[PDB]
Design a protein around this ligand. Structure first.
Ligand SMILES: Cc1c2ccccc2c(CCC(=O)O)c2ccccc12
Lengths: 219, 220
């Protein structure tokens, strides 16, 4: 089995930049007929994947002249001589030289911008949820950049790294930042067992976490 | 104009069966290789099966035996019989025409969604997220809405019926335990809220659900 490896999983770029996206095979991908079936696809948000390059270096008809492909042995490369706003999305490589046919994880082309500290907002369980017998403490880490962030919870000073659901937004088409919601879910009784609920954010803009908290009984 | 239209996608319980169809146009099957490729919720692309212009069939070991590609050359329709279905088989299915010994996936269809789950139609739980006494001590105020345990997807969330658009962040749903949970945050000026009315309008069509929750300041 040939496994296709793509890096990085996220490539931050500025428009007008010449970029190279890499893809590696776990072993050689030459078909028995001499051809190397390495293809590159661009999946534009909302749409389906579309062919860009076939057989390592052949630009498919209708594909812009800024896209090219190259590679040999186990290293293949996708080039975009000058990036536009339409080129943003995820790029997938794929080898069809050997069975099973393999897809790479994909590389998301995203926009670079100035660092942005996240705005951390913490919200205790709604009085309504409590009646139903549940307790969900949500916390929003919004409009931050870069996209790498760590959210830690601490119930009464003690870290509670269990039962937390996190979701992330795609880069904002407007300001180009990222946002994320982290929902800790407990029970009315377990929730009523603690007082201090805390949400700490470790962004490359803090190291010493952005902390937002509250006390069940008071503030 | 070449066309590929997938149909048959839908909700199927584990171990169950489903038949996907793909109506083609612009070309003939005897001249092109056909394949099915799926994109899982994680956005991962996986090859499911392909049939050559001649009839040769190929499956990856995980699909082999459970799924079956067949084609109606006469009515130029490609199929994919699915059985022994698992939750990981949940993905968007695309049929694709390729060029034999030239390019595998030259032309993709928009796809059809197949969701494998034992979950039952459950209306969402919509809770109003009011800020803690701390946050509110500034220029802006971020509010929120928790839309818990609903099935199936999707639900539609707005603020003040759409009146509140800028400064909103609606997060992608996630399965918590066979049920979907989603959350949205809305940031506005301090003099905007609670001075002005702010409501989270959530609808879950599948369960004929249309609920509204006004965000009120907490405190005794
Ligand atoms: C698109 C497509 C191909 C595209 C590029 C290269 C080979 C292709 C093959 C045959 C592959 C093989 O025999 O290993 C196919 C076999 C069946 C159906 C489609 C096929």
């Amino acid at each position: 089995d040939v496994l296709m490896t793509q890096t990085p999983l996220s490539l931050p770029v500025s428009l007008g930049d010449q970029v190279s996206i890499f893809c590696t095979s776990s072993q050689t991908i030459v078909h028995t007929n001499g051809n190397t079936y390495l293809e590159w696809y661009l999946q534009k948000p909302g749409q389906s994947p579309k062919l860009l390059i076939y057989k390592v270096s052949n630009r498919f008809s209708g594909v812009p002249d800024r896209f090219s492909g190259s590679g040999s042995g186990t290293d293949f490369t996708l080039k975009i001589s000058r990036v536009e706003t339409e080129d943003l999305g995820i790029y997938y490589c794929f080898q069809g030289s050997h069975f099973p046919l393999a897809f790479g994880a994909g590389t998301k082309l995203e926009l670079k911008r100035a660092d942005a500290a996240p705005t951390v907002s913490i919200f205790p369980p709604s009085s309504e949820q409590l009646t139903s017998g549940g307790a969900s403490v949500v916390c929003f880490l919004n409009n931050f950049y870069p996209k790498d962030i760590n959210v830690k919870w601490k119930i009464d000073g003690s870290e509670r790294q269990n039962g937390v659901l996190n979701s992330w937004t795609d880069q904002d088409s407007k300001d180009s930042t990222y946002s994320m919601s982290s929902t800790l879910t407990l029970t009315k009784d377990e929730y009523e067992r603690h007082n201090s609920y805390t949400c700490e954010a470790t962004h490359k803009t803090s190291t010493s976490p952005i902390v937002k908290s509250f006390n069940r009984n008071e503030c | 104009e070449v066309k590929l239209v997938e149909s048959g996608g839908g909700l199927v319980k584990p171990g169950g069966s489903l038949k996907l169809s793909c109506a083609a146009s612009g070309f003939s099957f005897r001249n092109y290789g056909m394949s099915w490729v799926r994109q899982t919720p994680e956005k991962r692309l996986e090859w499911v099966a392909s049939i050559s212009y001649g009839g040769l069939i190929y499956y990856p070991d995980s699909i082999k035996g459970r799924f079956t590609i067949s084609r109606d050359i006469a009515q130029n329709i490609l199929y994919l019989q699915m059985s022994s279905l698992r939750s990981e088989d949940t993905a968007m299915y695309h049929c694709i025409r390729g060029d034999s010994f030239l390019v595998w996936f030259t032309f993709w269809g928009q796809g059809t969604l197949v969701t494998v789950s034992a979950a039952k139609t459950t209306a969402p739980s919509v809770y109003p997220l009011a800020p803690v006494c701390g946050d509110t001590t500034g220029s802006s105020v971020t509010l929120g809405c928790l839309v818990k345990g609903y099935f199936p997807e999707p639900v539609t969330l707005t603020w003040n019926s759409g009146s509140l658009s800028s400064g909103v962040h609606t997060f992608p749903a996630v399965l918590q335990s066979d049920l979907y949970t989603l959350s949205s945050s809305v940031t506005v000026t301090s003099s905007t809220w609670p001075s002005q009315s702010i409501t989270c309008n959530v609808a879950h069509p599948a369960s004929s659900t249309q609920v509204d929750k006004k965000i009120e300041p907490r405190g005794p």
